[PDB]
Design an enzyme around this catalytic site. Sequence first.
Site, PDB file in Angstrom:
ATOM      1  N   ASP A 172      -2.861  -7.580  -5.408  1.00 48.22           N
ATOM      2  CA  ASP A 172      -2.640  -6.749  -4.239  1.00 48.22           C
ATOM      3  C   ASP A 172      -3.348  -7.393  -3.065  1.00 48.22           C
ATOM      4  O   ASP A 172      -4.556  -7.600  -3.105  1.00 48.22           O
ATOM      5  CB  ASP A 172      -3.110  -5.303  -4.454  1.00 48.22           C
ATOM      6  CG  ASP A 172      -2.782  -4.405  -3.301  1.00 48.22           C
ATOM      7  OD1 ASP A 172      -2.977  -4.708  -2.145  1.00 48.22           O
ATOM      8  OD2 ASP A 172      -2.234  -3.276  -3.677  1.00 48.22           O
TER       9      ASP A 172
ATOM     10  N   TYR B 276      -5.239  -8.224   4.951  1.00 50.16           N
ATOM     11  CA  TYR B 276      -4.588  -8.052   6.226  1.00 50.16           C
ATOM     12  C   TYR B 276      -3.682  -9.183   6.702  1.00 50.16           C
ATOM     13  O   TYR B 276      -3.796  -9.632   7.842  1.00 50.16           O
ATOM     14  CB  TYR B 276      -5.652  -7.708   7.289  1.00 50.16           C
ATOM     15  CG  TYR B 276      -6.176  -6.318   7.063  1.00 50.16           C
ATOM     16  CD1 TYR B 276      -5.397  -5.224   7.435  1.00 50.16           C
ATOM     17  CD2 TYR B 276      -7.369  -6.086   6.375  1.00 50.16           C
ATOM     18  CE1 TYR B 276      -5.821  -3.920   7.188  1.00 50.16           C
ATOM     19  CE2 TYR B 276      -7.812  -4.787   6.116  1.00 50.16           C
ATOM     20  CZ  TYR B 276      -7.030  -3.709   6.530  1.00 50.16           C
ATOM     21  OH  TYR B 276      -7.439  -2.438   6.303  1.00 50.16           O
TER      22      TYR B 276
ATOM     23  N   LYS C 265       0.944  -4.032   1.376  1.00 45.74           N
ATOM     24  CA  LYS C 265       1.177  -2.860   2.179  1.00 45.74           C
ATOM     25  C   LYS C 265       1.128  -3.113   3.665  1.00 45.74           C
ATOM     26  O   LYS C 265       0.406  -3.978   4.153  1.00 45.74           O
ATOM     27  CB  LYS C 265       0.188  -1.769   1.821  1.00 45.74           C
TER      28      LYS C 265
ATOM     29  N   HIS D 121       2.294   2.755   5.516  1.00 40.54           N
ATOM     30  CA  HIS D 121       1.201   3.640   5.855  1.00 40.54           C
ATOM     31  C   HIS D 121       1.387   5.162   5.782  1.00 40.54           C
ATOM     32  O   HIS D 121       2.492   5.703   5.782  1.00 40.54           O
ATOM     33  CB  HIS D 121       0.448   3.211   7.127  1.00 40.54           C
TER      34      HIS D 121
END
Length: 257
Positions: free
Chosen positions: A44, A49, A74, A102
Amino acid sequence: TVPSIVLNDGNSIPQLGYGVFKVPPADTQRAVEEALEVGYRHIDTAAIYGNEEGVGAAIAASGIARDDLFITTKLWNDEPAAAIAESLAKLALDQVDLYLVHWPTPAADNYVHAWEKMIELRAAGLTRSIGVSNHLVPHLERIVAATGVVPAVNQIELHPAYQQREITDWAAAHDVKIESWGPLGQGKYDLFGAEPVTAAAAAHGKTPAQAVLRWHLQKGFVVFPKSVRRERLEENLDVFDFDLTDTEIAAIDAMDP
Ligand SMILES: [Cl-]
Ligand SMILES: [Cl-]
Ligand SMILES: [Mg+2]
Ligand SMILES: [Mg+2]
């Protein structure tokens, strides 16, 4: 070893993954290679970022079949498509395994649109599976009714003191997997010192962290313990050799009010 969970879209996901954490971009490759050597196959990259170049390098140099890897990421902050496309380039991959957007907005005026976008991302093959984060029962009901597409995963804050039972129950009832965000409370409270925790650790000859991780696992949740030190990477992975009793589980479950 790490068991593979069944996703609602036909894909399977390793229940425990490595969350790239506290790694500067230049040392990212090395960190991932280390996790791979340890035994992790589920990575992950959220916490990094977008600094995914090093991740791509490790994967490329690893020797591991694509099909044997599970890449999750994500979108933090109309842009999931742009975001994922950029990540793909950095990762030098055709697609990721799991993509999540998000938390819904306080304004709650776009999470549906956000889900529609995710559905298109998937159709475009940018990701094999699509999921959400911090979606409550109502959010979930809404996106499903609106799109007809059920999320593969729902990432929510979860630990003994905070279990969000309504969400997990709903999820289980609709074949949605739950990913425990902040599995160990994030050091916000004395989790390791709790009687139910220490008691399980002692009984099984494991650490408190391990006992808690095991708790999530037995409960059928997906976790990404954020490791840094090799020692921890190792420990975090070694939680498939024991089983908490039903009584042990209930004592921990009781930690929430
Ligand atoms: Cl790929
Ligand atoms: Cl945590
Ligand atoms: Mg229903
Ligand atoms: Mg039983």
